[PDB]
């Protein structure tokens, strides 16, 4: 069939000069309005096809989900300990190694939450700690980001290692600091060039600098896992995912086909830890920013909170079904926030057909989630913070098909159920006890975010006054 259209491919750099790599989603909106919803790019040695709009994204990730659930090879991860039967979940190639870890994580999240509401309990308790840390800042403006990271990080640690850390814990702070630096290393120009040719990593000097913060994070994580292995009681049902992983590792002794080994444990845990730490935190940061930029929205949420929950009783997941406006606001935060504009890259394991065009096997697919969440043909006013995007005239919550912040298909975010819980419980608990506003004397903060692989809000301070 016909290959998708696109700008002129230069002999050497290809289409490297047609992309600014800063505000890339803005550049893709220009290419979409010039070549259509499915266009092509030649980024160096890599053939890339960009998918825009709900239809093009669904056609690849759902209709041809079997052929688009693979990941582009990342050779430099071998420094971190990545192997054939130890690829984790996030970067894992499409196959038995991914599916076993995928099915394990999805089911374990489900089991730890349905049995004794341990999922909901750790979040509820962490929200209370978050409220207290907010309370100590009262009377003075502050950046809420750091505290959001800690509260979000603790929820994960509660699911991985069955514990939380105090906000002033030296090892906790270091773990969080190393994590954020490790995100920046994955957004480096040096990475792409090093991803191209592996034997460049044979140079001792180069190999060391590649992932110095990321190796520090794993090392720090190893120390914590070793401690957790000591306190684990195999005679009891698993308290957390790591224990459940350890119990599987024992059963899989003598089986070289299993992905339940030591090398994969530290990688799967590092995956779950990082992925659900910077995403959920950033969203909560967006949520607070939008509440001080739109106080009228904040009051209506606080109104619905009182009419359903009160101001003393802690919020529960059962309350969400009775709070349609608050649900709309949270969904609109994710939509407007749009923290993962280009999603996570996929790769075709076969030849497929998207929107008539043909996509060769081994092609790197980019799902422009931004083009879906901001689609002007779907949303009433896509470039505004508008809670009524998820409400009808009567006030009922509706969820459009175009709400895809967690992407779609087999590779869709496995953390979504937990994310939904963290977002509702943290957001409601904060607004239940605090009124947020812009600090007087300071400029109105921009609703525009700083573009990266993960779009965070422009740096801002806020005032949190108790109620």
Single out the residue of 123, 176, 178, 275 in contact with ligand HEM (rule: CB under 6 A): 275
- Which tokens belong to 52? 């825009």
* Of 164 and 239, CB closest to Zn ion: 239
- Least Å distance, CB 467 to ligand P6U, is 34
> Is 452 among the residues that bind ligand P6U (CB under 6 A)?
no
For residue 43, what are the contacts with CB-CB under 8 A and spacing of at least 6? 14, 15, 16, 19
For residue 310, what are the contacts with CB-CB under 8 A and spacing of at least 6? none
The answer to whether the beta carbons of residues 47 and 357 sit under 8 Å apart is no
Which among ligand HEM, Zn ion, ligand P6U, none contacts residue 391 (Cβ within 5 to 8 A by kind)? none
User: Residue 52 gets which letter from DSSP?
Assistant: E
Kind and range of the H or E run holding 273 = helix 262-293
- Which tokens belong to 384? 């505004």
Measured CA to CA in angstroms, residue 412 lies from 59, 194, 352, 380 at distances of 14, 28, 19, 26
Which among Zn ion, ligand HEM, ligand P6U, none contacts residue 210 (Cβ within 5 to 8 A by kind)? none
Q: Which residue stretches of 294-415 are H helix?
A: 295-308, 324-337, 369-373
- Which tokens belong to 241? 């995912």
- Least Å distance, CB 285 to ligand HEM, is 11
Restricting to residues 366-425, which ones interact with Zn ion according to CB under 5 A? 392, 394, 396
* Of 220 and 437, CB closest to ligand P6U: 220
User: Residue 122 gets which letter from DSSP?
Assistant: H
161 is in an annotated binding site: no
What one-character-per-residue DSSP string does 171-206 give? HHHHHHHHHHHHHHHTT-HHHHHHHH-GGGGGSHHH
Q: Are strands 456-457 and 449-450 parallel, antiparallel or unpaired?
A: antiparallel
Site string for ligand HEM, 402-421 (x = CB under 6 A): ---xxx---xxxxx--xx--
271 is in an annotated binding site: yes
Restricting to residues 170-229, which ones interact with ligand P6U according to CB under 6 A? 179, 182-183, 186, 214, 217-218
d(CA 135, CA 311): 15
Bridge partners (DSSP) listed for residue 267? none
The answer to whether the beta carbons of residues 189 and 221 sit under 8 Å apart is no
Site stretch for ligand P6U (CB under 6 A), options 7-15, 271-279, 367-375, 395-403: 271-279
Site stretch for ligand HEM (CB under 6 A), options 177-185, 256-264, 272-280, 297-305: 272-280
For residue 435, what are the contacts with CB-CB under 8 A and spacing of at least 6? 298, 302, 464, 465, 466, 467
- Least Å distance, CB 28 to ligand P6U, is 19
Single out the residue of 274, 349, 368, 432 in contact with ligand P6U (rule: CB under 6 A): 274
Which among ligand P6U, ligand HEM, Zn ion, none contacts residue 160 (Cβ within 5 to 8 A by kind)? none
Site string for ligand HEM, 319-358 (x = CB under 6 A): --------------------xx--xx--------------
Environment class of 348 (CB within 10 Å of its CB; exposed 0-12, middle 13-18, buried 19+)? buried
* Of 65 and 439, CB closest to ligand HEM: 65
- Least Å distance, CB 35 to Zn ion, is 39
* Of 60 and 463, CB closest to ligand HEM: 60
Residue positions forming the annotated binding site? 271, 413
For ligand P6U, the binding residues (CB under 6 A) are 80, 90-91, 179, 182-183, 186, 214, 217-218, 270-271, 274-275, 278
Residue positions forming the annotated binding site for heme? 413
For ligand HEM, the binding residues (CB under 6 A) are 89-90, 102, 271-272, 275-276, 279-280, 283, 339-340, 343-344, 405-407, 411-415, 418-419
């Amino acid at each position: 069939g016909k290959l998708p259209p696109g700008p002129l491919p230069l002999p050497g750099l290809g289409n490297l000069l047609h992309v600014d790599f800063q505000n890339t989603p803005y550049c893709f909106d220009q290419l979409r309005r010039r070549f259509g919803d499915v266009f092509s790019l030649q980024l160096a040695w890599t053939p890339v096809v960009v998918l825009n709009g709900l239809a093009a994204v669904r056609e690849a990730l759902v209709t041809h989900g079997e052929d688009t659930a693979d990941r582009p090879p990342v050779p430099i991860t071998q420094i971190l300990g990545f192997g054939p039967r130890s690829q984790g979940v996030f970067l894992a190639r499409y196959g038995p190694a991914w599916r076993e870890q995928r099915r394990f994580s999805v089911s374990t999240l489900r089991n730890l939450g349905l049995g004794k509401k341990s999922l909901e309990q750790w979040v509820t308790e962490e929200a209370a700690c978050l409220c207290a840390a907010f309370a100590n800042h009262s009377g003075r403006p502050f950046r809420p980001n750091g505290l959001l990271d800690k509260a979000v990080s603790n929820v994960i640690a509660s699911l991985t290692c069955g514990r939380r850390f105090e906000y002033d814990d030296p090892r906790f702070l270091r773990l969080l600091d190393l994590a954020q630096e490790g995100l920046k290393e994955e957004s480096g120009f040096l990475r792409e060039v090093l991803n191209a040719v592996p034997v460049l990593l044979h140079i001792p000097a180069l190999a060391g600098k590649v992932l110095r913060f990321q190796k520090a994070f794993l090392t720090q994580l190893d120390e914590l896992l070793t401690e957790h292995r000591m306190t684990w009681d195999p005679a009891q049902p698993p308290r957390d995912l790591t224990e459940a992983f350890l119990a599987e590792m024992e059963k899989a002794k003598g089986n070289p086909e299993s992905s339940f080994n030591d090398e994969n444990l530290r990688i799967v845990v590092a995956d779950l830890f990082s992925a659900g730490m910077v995403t959920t935190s950033t969203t909560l940061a967006w949520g607070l920013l939008l509440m001080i930029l739109h106080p009228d929205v904040q009051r209506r949420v606080q109104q619905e909170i009182d009419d359903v929950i009160g101001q003393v009783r802690r919020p529960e997941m059962g309350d969400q079904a009775h709070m349609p406006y608050t649900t709309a606001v949270i969904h609109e935060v994710q939509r407007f926030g749009d923290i993962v504009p280009l999603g996570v890259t996929h790769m075709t394991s076969r030849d497929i057909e998207v929107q008539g065009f043909r996509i060769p096997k081994g092609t790197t697919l980019i799902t422009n989630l931004s083009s879906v969440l901001k689609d002007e043909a779907v949303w009433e006013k896509p470039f505004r913070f508008h809670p009524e995007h998820f409400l009808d005239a009567q006030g009922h919550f509706v969820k459009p098909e175009a709400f895809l912040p967690f992407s779609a298909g087999r590779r869709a975010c496995l953390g979504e159920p937990l994310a939904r819980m963290e977002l509702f419980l943290f957001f409601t608990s904060l607004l239940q006890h605090f009124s947020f506003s812009v600090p007087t004397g300071q400029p109105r903060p921009s609703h525009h975010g700083v573009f990266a692989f993960l779009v965070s809000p422009s740096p801002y301070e806020l005032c949190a006054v108790p109620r």
